């Protein structure tokens, strides 16, 4: 329920940052899922090449997901799953991307 409500503006880009997160070496699988459709859009696996569904997205150091030129569909519930080199969950956070038709 801790949906860190985020506010975006139609047409502009937005950054989904993970709070008190710090990039380490124990990190391995950084996952960004778009609830509704239920399929990852971005994923950083240790050293295996950053995966991105659409160039509309971009992974930024410290697992930050970037959503270029927001759209009407780009309004969803985004979740981030970060795992360490042992298959353990390092942290889990949810973002409520609410784009305003200003």
């Amino acid at each position: 329920t801790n949906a860190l409500e985020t506010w975006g503006a139609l047409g502009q880009d937005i950054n989904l940052d993970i709070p008190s997160f710090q990039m380490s070496d124990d990190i391995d699988d950084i996952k960004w899922e778009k609830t509704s459709d239920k399929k990852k859009i971005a994923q950083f696996r240790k050293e295996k090449e950053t995966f991105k569904e659409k160039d509309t997205y971009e992974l930024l150091k410290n697992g930050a997901l970037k959503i270029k030129h927001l759209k009407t569909d780009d309004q969803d519930i985004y979740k981030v799953s970060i795992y360490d080199t042992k298959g353990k969950n390092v942290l889990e956070k949810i973002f409520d991307l609410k784009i305003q038709e200003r």
Partner: protein, 95 residues
């Protein structure tokens, strides 16, 4: 939805996934943490579950060996060639 799987210490179980198409990308979880995964075809068991399991490369079914009672938990699997998650609950029986 969730299926209750009963097992026995030192024994082994098998999580049967009612599939058809060879999902070549799957991930098994023991709650928040991972168990075994399949990425672009590169198997990988984590922590304790190393050498301890076998994943069916067709029906995405999972098989754990040598139960340790510390395995009695909530298991769940995911896959893109999906149709909403499968959640199994293992009950490490007594003997």
């Amino acid at each position: 939805s969730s299926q209750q799987i009963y097992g026995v210490k030192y024994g082994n179980v098998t999580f049967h996934v009612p599939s058809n198409q060879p999902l070549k990308e799957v991930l098994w979880k023991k709650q928040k943490d991972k168990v075994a995964e399949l990425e672009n075809s590169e198997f990988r068991a984590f922590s304790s579950f190393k050498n301890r399991v076998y994943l069916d490369t067709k029906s995405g079914s999972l098989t754990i060996y040598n139960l340790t009672s510390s395995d009695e938990d909530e298991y769940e699997m995911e896959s893109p060639n999906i149709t909403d998650s499968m959640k199994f609950f293992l009950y490490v029986g007594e003997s």
